[PDB]
Amino acid sequence: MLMPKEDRNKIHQYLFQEGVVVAKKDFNQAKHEEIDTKNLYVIKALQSLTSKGYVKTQFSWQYYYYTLTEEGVEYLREYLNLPEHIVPGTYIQERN
Amino acid sequence: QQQQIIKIRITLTSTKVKQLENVSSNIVKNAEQHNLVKKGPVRLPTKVLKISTRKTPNGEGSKTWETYEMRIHKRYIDLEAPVQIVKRITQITIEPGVDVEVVVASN
Amino acid sequence: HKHKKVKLAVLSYYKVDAEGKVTKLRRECSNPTGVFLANHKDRLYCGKCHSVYKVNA
Amino acid sequence: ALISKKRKLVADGVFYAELNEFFTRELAEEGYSGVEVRVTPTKTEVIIRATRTQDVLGENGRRINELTLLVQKRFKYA
Amino acid sequence: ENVWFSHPRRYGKGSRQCRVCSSHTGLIRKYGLNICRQCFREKANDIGFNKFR
RNA sequence: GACGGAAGGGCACCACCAGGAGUGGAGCCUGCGGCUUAAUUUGACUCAACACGGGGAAACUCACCAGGUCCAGACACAAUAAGGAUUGACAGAUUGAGAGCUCUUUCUUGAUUUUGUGGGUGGUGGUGCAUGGCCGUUCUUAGUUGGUGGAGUGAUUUGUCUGCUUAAUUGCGAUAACGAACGAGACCUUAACCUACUAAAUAGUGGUGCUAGCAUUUGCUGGUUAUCCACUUCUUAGAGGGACUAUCGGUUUCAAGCCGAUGGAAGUUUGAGGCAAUAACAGGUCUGUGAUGCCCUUAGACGUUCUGGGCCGCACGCGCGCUACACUGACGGAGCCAGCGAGUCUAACCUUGGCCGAGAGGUCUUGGUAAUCUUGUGAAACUCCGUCGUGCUGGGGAUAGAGCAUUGUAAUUAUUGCUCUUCAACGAGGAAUUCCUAGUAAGCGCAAGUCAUCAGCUUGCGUUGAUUACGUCCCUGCCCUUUGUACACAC
Ligand SMILES: [Mg+2]
Ligand SMILES: [Mg+2]
Ligand SMILES: [Mg+2]
Numbered sequence: 058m059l060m061p062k063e064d065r066n067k068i069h070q071y072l073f074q075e076g077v078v079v080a081k082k083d084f085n086q087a088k089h090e091e092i093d094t095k096n097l098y099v100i101k102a103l104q105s106l107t108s109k110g111y112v113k114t115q116f117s118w119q120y121y122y123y124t125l126t127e128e129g130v131e132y133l134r135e136y137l138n139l140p141e142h143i144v145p146g147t148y149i150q151e152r153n
Numbered sequence: 154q155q156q157q158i159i160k161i162r163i164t165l166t167s168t169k170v171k172q173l174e175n176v177s178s179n180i181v182k183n184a185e186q187h188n189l190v191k192k193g194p195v196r197l198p199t200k201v202l203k204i205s206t207r208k209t210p211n212g213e214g215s216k217t218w219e220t221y222e223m224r225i226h227k228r229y230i231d232l233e234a235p236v237q238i239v240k241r242i243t244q245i246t247i248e249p250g251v252d253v254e255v256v257v258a259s260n
Numbered sequence: 261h262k263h264k265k266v267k268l269a270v271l272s273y274y275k276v277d278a279e280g281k282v283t284k285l286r287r288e289c290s291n292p293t294g295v296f297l298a299n300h301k302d303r304l305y306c307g308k309c310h311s312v313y314k315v316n317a
Numbered sequence: 318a319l320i321s322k323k324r325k326l327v328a329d330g331v332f333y334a335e336l337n338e339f340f341t342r343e344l345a346e347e348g349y350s351g352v353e354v355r356v357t358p359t360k361t362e363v364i365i366r367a368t369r370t371q372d373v374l375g376e377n378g379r380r381i382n383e384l385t386l387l388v389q390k391r392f393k394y395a
Numbered sequence: 396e397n398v399w400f401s402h403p404r405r406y407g408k409g410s411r412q413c414r415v416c417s418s419h420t421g422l423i424r425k426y427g428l429n430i431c432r433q434c435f436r437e438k439a440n441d442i443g444f445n446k447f448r
Numbered sequence: 449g450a451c452g453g454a455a456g457g458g459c460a461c462c463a464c465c466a467g468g469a470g471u472g473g474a475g476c477c478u479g480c481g482g483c484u485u486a487a488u489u490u491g492a493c494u495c496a497a498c499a500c501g502g503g504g505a506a507a508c509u510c511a512c513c514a515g516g517u518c519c520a521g522a523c524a525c526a527a528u529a530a531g532g533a534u535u536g537a538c539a540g541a542u543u544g545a546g547a548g549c550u551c552u553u554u555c556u557u558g559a560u561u562u563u564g565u566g567g568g569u570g571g572u573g574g575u576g577c578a579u580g581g582c583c584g585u586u587c588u589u590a591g592u593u594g595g596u597g598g599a600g601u602g603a604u605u606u607g608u609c610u611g612c613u614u615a616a617u618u619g620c621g622a623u624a625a626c627g628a629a630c631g632a633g634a635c636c637u638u639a640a641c642c643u644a645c646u647a648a649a650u651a652g653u654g655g656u657g658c659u660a661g662c663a664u665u666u667g668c669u670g671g672u673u674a675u676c677c678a679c680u681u682c683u684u685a686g687a688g689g690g691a692c693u694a695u696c697g698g699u700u701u702c703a704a705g706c707c708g709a710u711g712g713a714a715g716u717u718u719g720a721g722g723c724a725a726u727a728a729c730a731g732g733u734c735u736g737u738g739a740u741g742c743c744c745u746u747a748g749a750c751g752u753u754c755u756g757g758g759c760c761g762c763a764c765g766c767g768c769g770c771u772a773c774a775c776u777g778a779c780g781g782a783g784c785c786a787g788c789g790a791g792u793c794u795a796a797c798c799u800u801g802g803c804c805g806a807g808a809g810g811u812c813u814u815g816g817u818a819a820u821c822u823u824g825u826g827a828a829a830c831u832c833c834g835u836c837g838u839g840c841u842g843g844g845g846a847u848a849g850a851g852c853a854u855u856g857u858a859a860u861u862a863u864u865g866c867u868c869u870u871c872a873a874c875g876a877g878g879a880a881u882u883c884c885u886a887g888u889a890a891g892c893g894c895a896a897g898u899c900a901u902c903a904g905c906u907u908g909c910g911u912u913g914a915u916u917a918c919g920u921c922c923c924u925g926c927c928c929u930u931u932g933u934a935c936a937c938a939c
């Protein structure tokens with residue numbers, strides 16, 4: 058339908074803070090796990106990203122494995138306006 | 154802790170029977186070298202999981218049927234063991250693909 | 261399906277320089293989403309008090 | 318979690334079958350020859366066998382942590 | 396804002412689907428596979444189901 | 449090569465002989481055609497369509513019909529807009545409706561969007577005669593191929609065969625063939641045995657540290673394994689052992705083999721399956737797939753969702769089935785014995801025991817994530833003791849009425865269960881036709897599958913357990929050789 062701005066924000070920062078996003082392929086569930094929004098809005102918004110880019114999508118039994126491509130790391134950095142090149146978010150963070 | 158029995162029960166289950174036999178022989182092996190009183194490895198009946206399905210994806214053809222078998226073998230051993238001796242042998246060198254359960258009984 | 265939404269200014273307020281002090285009647289209510297609401301024929305529409313709302317104006 | 322052994326081993330096989338088709342859908346170029354699962358206590362390790370290790374490990378630690386987080390995020394694993 | 400768009404799915408064919416292809420027909424819910432009998436045939440081997448007799 | 453109303457030889461209870469159970473007749477179930485319909489959704493039509501799509505459909509399933517919503521129309525471009533793109537909307541009309549769908553109405557979040565162009569996406573839409581994969585069939589038969597050599601200008605042939613043998617192109621032999629490979633076999637799983645090893649309070653046995661009850665001078669039975677000891681015969685599962693037609697006799701070209709007797713747990717490839725060569729089929733499946741080519745559709749949708757109906761509709765024909773036509777039985781009581789399973793904390797799964805209720809079932813609880821508890825699944829056929837007494841009868845339960853319950857949001861077109869009540873056809877079934885050689889046929893139930901509920905269905909399991917024959921090419925089908933061919937899209 059129409060994604061509210063805080064839903065769009067909370068989806069983008071969640072994808073930023075660890076890179077990957079998983080979403081069950083079932084619409085009209087309305088209770089997404091580990092993200093407090095409707096499951097339909099998660100898939101639809103990520104489809105809007107993936108067409109422009111920024112995301113590599115794989116399906117694997119209706120499970121929608123999403124991954125943040127290197128070109129798309131800087132776009133969400135611009136969207137969230139996080140300080141530039143202080144954290145990759147979060148692929149190489151602790152072990153080093 | 155000062156040489157006090159725990160009355161442990163180790164139960165092993167997996168589909169891959171052959172390497173479960175080795176570990177069941179391994180668990181019994183490290184008992185007599187430490188002079189451990191025990192009840193031997195008790196083998197339980199195999200549960201033959203069976204699925205009866207048509208070969209065909211459609212409905213055409215002769216009505217041929219397949220039976221698939223996911224065998225599972227369950228064993229269990231009762232060991233009168235110290236607290237120290239069981240932990241440094243069962244928390245290390247665990248075989249692949251075999252499920253093990255460590256439970257305590259104090260009847 | 262949608263109305264024109266003509267070039268309206270603020271409503272339900274008389275005038276700011278009506279000889280010569282500010283004139284805005286109907287003193288503040290507990291609803292800021294304060295503000296008025298959709299009133300058609302002796303009825304009220306819930307705007308903020310989603311659960312409990314007891315007034316008949 | 319007190320789940321029967323017959324249903325648990327079946328779910329373990331479905332877990333392996335999920336990993337098998339998941340890995341070959343992205344690690345197709347890596348010469349994915351299969352995978353192994355070793356359920357050690359509190360640490361189940363996924364042993365991915367691929368003929369091109371230089372890209373499944375990625376660079377600097379990438380392309381593997383993302384898959385590590387993807388399997389964690391789906392299967393509700395700590 | 397959306398209530399009429401739903402009907403109960405607590406039981407029956409519509410309350411379940413294949414975990415691989417969402418096929419409402421031919422499901423094997425025995426042992427909690429929840430795989431249709433046709434996707435199961437391709438994937439019986441890697442789960443652990445083998446033909447012996 | 450195919451075919452032959454050509455000859456010859458083999459093989460097979462998807463062929464026959466000797467038989468057994470039947471089916472086809474009856475009544476209901478179920479599928480297909482037809483008819484009818486708004487729709488009665490479709491695929492498949494000899495074996496190789498027709499209780500098949502795991503297709504036991506009230507909603508879903510759903511693909512059909514009568515209608516109502518939404519865009520889950522990504523992204524790019526141009527408009528529109530911040531003098532507000534649009535969205536949500538209480539009430540009533542409208543609507544099946546408590547869908548703000550639309551209308552009387554005007555408040556609210558705020559380039560999350562709308563309009564159009566493209567272009568994607570979805571489609572149980574079509575094409576299985578564009579395909580992959582899987583499956584079925586030729587064929588579960590025994591067949592297929594090449595290296596070197598021989599024959600032929602060649603296409604091709606020999607090997608790959610007259611004979612005998614085998615389930616087998618299995619071998620013995622013959623021999624311009626020789627040595628091979630796949631298939632077959634070997635192999636794997638399972639059943640049968642193990643008083644031999646490993647062991648076991650989740651299996652069982654016996655004595656008893658503890659004992660108890662009944663009847664009598666010990667038989668049956670109930671509990672404790674620091675309120676005990678010992679063990680594995682029965683059960684289990686690991687390692688293994690064991691059968692190789694062993695021994696003897698007969699027959700055979702005295703070869704492969706076959707037959708009989710003995711012994712043995714096993715002498716039908718020891719029984720039964722898993723896998724299964726080459727070459728194919730215009731076999732089936734696009735209605736399993738987020739497998740897919742192409743085409744069609746895509747906002748008044750062939751997308752999806754919701755409401756209700758239909759797939760079950762009934763002059764008729766056909767197939768798979770269930771219950772019977774009775775005494776070798778129906779009914780009543782009593783005796784009362786299996787095996788393969790499955791099963792809940794990711795909340796109602798299996799349900800024991802107590803209570804209520806004719807019954808169905810309701811209720812209070814217990815156990816079991818399971819060799820522990822459901823469950824010794826105390827199943828049915830069966831056995832005994834009685835009532836009936838050859839009567840469409842107490843056979844049979846079709847149809848139909850009333851009521852009591854369970855499952856489901858919903859039972860009407862009766863989901864099903866139970867109680868009373870009507871007691872229809874059918875008196876062993878025409879033409880024809882199916883399956884089957886020993887724990888087999890047949891009878892009898894039980895479990896699981898689908899499953900909220902419903903099996904008359906299927907996959908397995910166990911109970912009771914025959915008759916007949918150890919064969920042949922008479923029919924049918926297949927293969928091979930010879931032969932004929934104007935066939936090769938192959939009669
Ligand atoms: Mg016949
Ligand atoms: Mg006959
Ligand atoms: Mg008959």
Ligand SMILES: [Mg+2]
Pocket residue numbers: none
């Ligand atoms: Mg009949």
Ligand SMILES: [Mg+2]
Pocket residue numbers: none
């Ligand atoms: Mg039904």
Ligand SMILES: [Mg+2]
Pocket residue numbers: 510
């Ligand atoms: Mg329907």
Ligand SMILES: [Mg+2]
Pocket residue numbers: 576731
């Ligand atoms: Mg075809």
Ligand SMILES: [Mg+2]
Pocket residue numbers: 608
């Ligand atoms: Mg030849």
Ligand SMILES: [Mg+2]
Pocket residue numbers: none
């Ligand atoms: Mg041979």
Ligand SMILES: [Mg+2]
Pocket residue numbers: 759
């Ligand atoms: Mg139908």
Ligand SMILES: [Mg+2]
Pocket residue numbers: 824
């Ligand atoms: Mg029993």
Ligand SMILES: [Mg+2]
Pocket residue numbers: none
């Ligand atoms: Mg009667």
Ligand SMILES: [Mg+2]
Pocket residue numbers: 871
């Ligand atoms: Mg009568």
Ligand SMILES: [Mg+2]
Pocket residue numbers: 499905
């Ligand atoms: Mg069926």
Ligand SMILES: [Mg+2]
Pocket residue numbers: 932
């Ligand atoms: Mg002639």
